[PDB]
Ligand binder design. Structure first.
Ligand SMILES: O=c1cc(-c2ccc(O)cc2)oc2cc(O)cc(O)c12
Ligand SMILES: [Cl-]
Length: 275
């Protein structure tokens, strides 16, 4: 599918850079016609079929297709798409309070503070999973705060670059995210479903409560081996005053067999979360 090929600079002015990764850079921008503000994500295109640099058209179109489907307070929304010879430019909702990763760095949370974030994450993922969309890259860097200077910051899930529709219960694709957060089925290159996201939520929850990462080794291969072996424990130094119910919630997510792992619906009914 083709996107708007007018120069994006004809319609938007860019400002502060919000961040960049391997194949994308995100700039704050303002639409000339409305004065409304957005985040412009410039995704570098592949320039030959067999190249390893840039993002394939198929991968860009998948991200755009998924983004076009979603409208929920806890997920980013897509406003427009432009493209030129070098980039596809997604004009996305602006979330200006920064990464959950940075919020966590600057101050571990109480169980109340953790559940305040977690409930929003769970609500966003419930929406996604209800539409059979697996995110496949859930982690604190991909959770953005609307306003970080309130006591209970609101969040939105971002970065749908690995997201897939799961119409057949699983995808068998060599999809692979950040070692610290990927489920064992990802590490083992097995068929993947919505369950992989629930593992990631377990990892996020562990980090929220402790400030420590459950499977992190000194190298990527160590982290991956730890994940596959479910090599983690609740260190007393970190978890001594954490409730047994909170640990129960995590324990039922960090389960190797995806069929035995809590689903998103299970997580919302779990006694630690259920109102
Ligand atoms: O640093 C990043 C920031 C954002 C982002 C996306 C939307 C916003 O409203 C605010 C920030 O998306 C990203 C997407 C990527 O694939 C990589 C990034 O670094 C970012
Ligand atoms: Cl994004």
């Amino acid at each position: 599918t083709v996107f708007r090929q007018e120069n994006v600079d004809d319609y938007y002015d860019t400002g502060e850079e919000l961040g960049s990764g391997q194949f994308a850079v995100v700039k704050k921008c303002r639409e000339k016609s409305t004065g409304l503000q957005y985040a412009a994500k410039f995704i570098k295109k592949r320039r030959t079929k067999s190249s390893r640099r840039g993002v394939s058209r198929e991968d860009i179109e998948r991200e755009v297709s998924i983004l076009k489907e979603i409208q929920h307070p806890n997920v980013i929304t897509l406003h427009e798409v432009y493209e030129n010879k070098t980039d596809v430019i997604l004009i996305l909702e602006l979330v200006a309070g920064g990464e959950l990763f940075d919020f966590l760095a600057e101050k571990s949370l109480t169980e109340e503070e953790a559940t305040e974030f977690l409930k929003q994450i769970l609500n966003g993922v419930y929406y996604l999973h209800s539409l059979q969309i697996a995110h496949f890259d859930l982690k604190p860097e991909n959770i953005m705060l609307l306003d970080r200077n309130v006591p209970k910051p609101r969040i939105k899930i971002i970065d749908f670059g690995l997201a897939h529709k799961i119409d057949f219960g699983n995808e068998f694709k060599n999809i692979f995210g950040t070692p610290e957060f990927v489920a064992p089925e990802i590490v083992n290159y097995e068929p993947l479903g919505l369950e992989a996201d629930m593992w990631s939520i377990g990892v996020i929850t562990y980090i929220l409560l402790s400030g420590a990462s459950p499977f992190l080794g000194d190298t990527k291969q160590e982290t991956l081996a730890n994940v596959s072996a479910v090599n983690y424990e609740f260190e007393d130094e970190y978890f001594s005053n954490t409730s047994a119910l909170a640990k129960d919630f995590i324990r039922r997510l960090l389960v190797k067999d995806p069929k035995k792992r809590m689903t998103i619906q299970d997580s919302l009914q779990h006694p630690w979360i259920k109102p």
